[PDB]
Amino acid sequence: VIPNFEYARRLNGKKVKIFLRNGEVLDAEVTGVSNYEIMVKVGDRNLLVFKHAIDYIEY
Amino acid sequence: NFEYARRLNGKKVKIFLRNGEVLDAEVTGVSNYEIMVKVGDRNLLVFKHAIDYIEY
Amino acid sequence: NFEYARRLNGKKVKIFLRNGEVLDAEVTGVSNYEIMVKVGDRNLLVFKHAIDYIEY
Amino acid sequence: IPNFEYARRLNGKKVKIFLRNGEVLDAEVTGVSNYEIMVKVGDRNLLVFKHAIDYIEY
Amino acid sequence: PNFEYARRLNGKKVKIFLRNGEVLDAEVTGVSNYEIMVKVGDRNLLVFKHAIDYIEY
Amino acid sequence: NFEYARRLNGKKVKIFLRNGEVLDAEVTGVSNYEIMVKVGDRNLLVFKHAIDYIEY
Numbered sequence: 001v002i003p004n005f006e007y008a009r010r011l012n013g014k015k016v017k018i019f020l021r022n023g024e025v026l027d028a029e030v031t032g033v034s035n036y037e038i039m040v041k042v043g044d045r046n047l048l049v050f051k052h053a054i055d056y057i058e059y
Numbered sequence: 060n061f062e063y064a065r066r067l068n069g070k071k072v073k074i075f076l077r078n079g080e081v082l083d084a085e086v087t088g089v090s091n092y093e094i095m096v097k098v099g100d101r102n103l104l105v106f107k108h109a110i111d112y113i114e115y
Numbered sequence: 116n117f118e119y120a121r122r123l124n125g126k127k128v129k130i131f132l133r134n135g136e137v138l139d140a141e142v143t144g145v146s147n148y149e150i151m152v153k154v155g156d157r158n159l160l161v162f163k164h165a166i167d168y169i170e171y
Numbered sequence: 172i173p174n175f176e177y178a179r180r181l182n183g184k185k186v187k188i189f190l191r192n193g194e195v196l197d198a199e200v201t202g203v204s205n206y207e208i209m210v211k212v213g214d215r216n217l218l219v220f221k222h223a224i225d226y227i228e229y
Numbered sequence: 230p231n232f233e234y235a236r237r238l239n240g241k242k243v244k245i246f247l248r249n250g251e252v253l254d255a256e257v258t259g260v261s262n263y264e265i266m267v268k269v270g271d272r273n274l275l276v277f278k279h280a281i282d283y284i285e286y
Numbered sequence: 287n288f289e290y291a292r293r294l295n296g297k298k299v300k301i302f303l304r305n306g307e308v309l310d311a312e313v314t315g316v317s318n319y320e321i322m323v324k325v326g327d328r329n330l331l332v333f334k335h336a337i338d339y340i341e342y
């Protein structure tokens with residue numbers, strides 16, 4: 001039990017806005033989180049998003 | 060197991076992002092890779108890799 | 116340990132790179148740091164650090 | 172050996188920090204961790220992430 | 230894990246698409262965890278993998 | 287886990303930085319994450335993450 005380990009895993013199943021490093025914004029639902037990836041649904045599309053490409057997430 | 064960023068928990072700071080934005084933020088949590096903040100009525104998860112520096 | 120990218124092996128995907136390029140790519144291999152693809156007749160080694168996201 | 176770094180040898184020194192965003196910090200170094208450099212810049216206190224630094228002149 | 234496909238490029242002549250838009254026509258002479266050593270014409274370069282977007286071979 | 291950059295210690299090199307700058311340098315030290323150089327009269331600590339490639 002390490003409380004301050006990874007906050008991103010708590011986003012699984014949630015509606016979020018993902019702000020990517022190039023300025024793109026994803027209105028997403030999170031469908032999975034790994035150490036390095038966040039899986040999302042955006043509209044009809046399924047995306048694997050690398051965390052290194054994310055600047056911040058609004059939730 | 061030491062990070063200076065942990066010293067900023069609960070504090071008002073200015074986060075200078077790699078995208079050029081400056082967040083007027085209250086820090087609500089610090090993990091190894093993330094900083095959780097309140098900016099106005101918004102809750103953000105900020106990745107440390109996207110931060111250039113923090114003024115405190 | 117676990118990664119979702121390995122499950123894309125054998126799929127045809129759209130890889131959106133950090134430079135704004137998109138690759139219409141058949142995935143032929145995945146390692147911790149790399150994704151091997153065929154794009155048309157070209158064979159590429161793509162570094163995961165250069166990928167923003169993948170549509171599958 | 173493990174965790175040797177030159178950056179902590181700049182601890183307590185006046186330096187110029189050239190950031191990836193084009194900014195140059197005229198800085199006094201007050202602490203160095205594995206991933207961060209703490210600095211005073213004039214009357215400002217900054218936590219600078221090493222990943223945002225291109226090079227440091229000392 | 231901790232397999233690298235890049236090691237198999239040793240001895241090949243490849244196109245390295247760098248993160249800034251430059252492209253190197255490069256003979257690979259060595260590969261480490263973080264670096265690719267190349268010959269580009271008469272020039273010897275150490276290329277950091279973090280600066281590479283992709284490699285065509 | 288080997289690194290080629292260590293063998294640049296003491297050598298004249300040209301360092302091509304991610305910002306488009308080029309350093310005509312002599313290497314004075316190499317660590318896991320840093321390369322120390324002299325450029326003319328200036329002493330610099332260069333982070334490897336900021337380097338694209340090195341001509342030597």
Ligand SMILES: O=c1ccn([C@@H]2O[C@H](COP(=O)(O)O)[C@@H](O)[C@H]2O)c(=O)[nH]1
Nearest residue numbers: 006008035036051052092106107108164
């Ligand atoms: O256990 C881990 C490992 C990595 N990351 C995320 O992945 C990024 C690594 O991206 P890269 O620069 O290594 O490609 C980290 O900055 C962090 O955001 C995590 O959240 N947890």
Ligand SMILES: O=c1ccn([C@@H]2O[C@H](COP(=O)(O)O)[C@@H](O)[C@H]2O)c(=O)[nH]1
Nearest residue numbers: 051052062091092107108206220221222
């Ligand atoms: O234990 C760790 C691991 C990573 N980081 C921060 O997360 C960043 C990861 O960025 P990246 O791996 O995406 O490049 C590091 O540069 C550092 O600022 C930490 O603070 N502590």
Ligand SMILES: O=c1ccn([C@@H]2O[C@H](COP(=O)(O)O)[C@@H](O)[C@H]2O)c(=O)[nH]1
Nearest residue numbers: 036050052118147148149162163164165
């Ligand atoms: O065991 C690992 C190591 C790395 N990565 C991902 O690959 C990136 C590095 O790949 P590359 O493009 O940098 O070669 C990491 O930041 C992370 O996103 C993984 O998924 N698993």
Ligand SMILES: O=c1ccn([C@@H]2O[C@H](COP(=O)(O)O)[C@@H](O)[C@H]2O)c(=O)[nH]1
Nearest residue numbers: 174176205206207221222319333334335
């Ligand atoms: O033990 C460490 C870990 C990281 N760093 C610096 O922090 C950066 C964090 O980037 P990354 O490893 O997250 O990609 C490294 O590139 C390096 O400049 C160090 O100096 N020592």
Ligand SMILES: O=c1ccn([C@@H]2O[C@H](COP(=O)(O)O)[C@@H](O)[C@H]2O)c(=O)[nH]1
Nearest residue numbers: 148162163164231233262263278279335
């Ligand atoms: O064992 C390793 C360690 C790193 N890398 C590559 O080197 C990069 C290091 O650069 P970065 O972590 O600073 O982006 C990794 O992202 C990955 O592409 C490997 O291929 N194998």
Ligand SMILES: O=c1ccn([C@@H]2O[C@H](COP(=O)(O)O)[C@@H](O)[C@H]2O)c(=O)[nH]1
Nearest residue numbers: 263277278279289291318319320334335
């Ligand atoms: O043992 C290491 C660790 C890092 N690096 C360099 O520092 C960069 C950032 O460190 P990291 O992201 O691999 O931790 C890497 O891309 C690589 O160029 C090395 O040469 N050797």
Ligand SMILES: [Cl-]
Nearest residue numbers: 087088095096
């Ligand atoms: Cl929180």
Ligand SMILES: [Cl-]
Nearest residue numbers: 143144151152
């Ligand atoms: Cl393959």
Ligand code: NA
Nearest residue numbers: 092106107108
């Ligand atoms: Na981070």
Ligand code: NA
Nearest residue numbers: 108109222335
């Ligand atoms: Na980084």
Ligand code: NA
Nearest residue numbers: 206220221222
């Ligand atoms: Na850092």
Ligand code: NA
Nearest residue numbers: 263277278279
């Ligand atoms: Na590298």
Ligand code: NA
Nearest residue numbers: 319333334335
């Ligand atoms: Na580095």
